[PDB]
A = this chain, B = another copy of it.
Amino acid sequence: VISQTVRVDIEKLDNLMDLMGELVIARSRILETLKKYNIKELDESLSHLSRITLDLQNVVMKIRMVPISFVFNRFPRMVRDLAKKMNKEVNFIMRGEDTELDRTFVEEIGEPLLHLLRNAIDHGIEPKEERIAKGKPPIGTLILSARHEGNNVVIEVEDDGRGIDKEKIIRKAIEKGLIDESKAATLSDQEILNFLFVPGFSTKEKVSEVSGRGVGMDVVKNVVESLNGSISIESEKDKGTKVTIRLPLT
């Protein structure tokens, strides 16, 4: 009878990934050197080596896999704290905590999600008294969801709050040389909302920028795109807002 599986520490995985990278580099310089030769079974000897390195890396990536709980678990308290600090009442729900990602993806996607969450609590959800007056459920609900679907990983943040004012976006868009009135009426809903990812889409204020990349919504897309992922927004007045983030799953 047997007792199972084993704990390691980062430094080893760190040391492992370093050599993995060096292995990739070395394999590439070999293929470049012998690229001039056209020998038949030399190709198969090289292709075999590549196949090994790939399958070797492919296993490493399966070790890299990590539950998104590492980040999600930090949230319910922060959402709780943010809610009362901003004088709001929110019912916060997490779904798909078990969904597993590459370790790199998880320790990147953390801050952008926290941002989107704060956005929902701050600008999204109306004060309780306003919700009751409009016929909406007294307490706003906030859903952070992560699912394995297709060959991608889909993370969604959804709220039933105010929603986003598209006209305010369009007017600001024209306010500083982006479009005019004519090419404004030709815009789909999503590409209107896509203005929010423009660097410093300004109703806010200038920022002096140190040590980082940026401050707000333009950074979310930046992080997502650094992971070769995708992002867009759905919203309409007095119904709610949903941000969808898709990440390539390997």
Interface residues of A (CB under 8 A from B): 1-13, 15-16, 19-20, 22-23, 26-27, 29-30, 33-34, 37, 39, 41-42, 45-46, 48-49, 52-53, 55-56, 59-60, 62-64, 66, 70-71, 74, 103, 106-108, 110-111
Contact = CB atoms under 8 A, between A and B. Distances in A.
B71 A52 contact: no
Given A3-B103, A27-B49, 11 more contacts: A4-B9, A5-B11, A6-B9, A6-B10, A6-B64, A6-B66, A8-B63, A16-B59, A19-B55, A19-B56, A30-B30
Contacts of A107: 1-3
B53 A12 contact: no
A59 B52 CA distance: 17
A59 B56 CA distance: 14
A20 B62 contact: no
A55 B16 CA distance: 9
Contacts of A10: 4-6
Contact of A3 (B2, B27, B70): B70
Q: How many copies does the complex hold?
A: 2
A74 B3 contact: yes
Contacts of A56: 16, 19-20, 23
B3 A60 contact: no
Nearest 9 A-B pairs (CB), nearest first? Answer: A1-B110, A5-B9, A7-B7, A3-B70, A26-B49, A19-B56, A33-B45, A8-B63, A30-B45
6 contacts: A1-B74, A3-B110, A7-B7, A23-B53, A29-B45, A34-B39
Given A27-B49, A48-B26, A7 B4 contact: no
Contacts of A6: 7-10, 13, 63-64, 66, 103
A70 B16 CA distance: 25
A8 B7 contact: yes
A18 B59 CA distance: 11
Contact of A23 (B1, B8, B9, B52): B52
Nearest to A113: B1
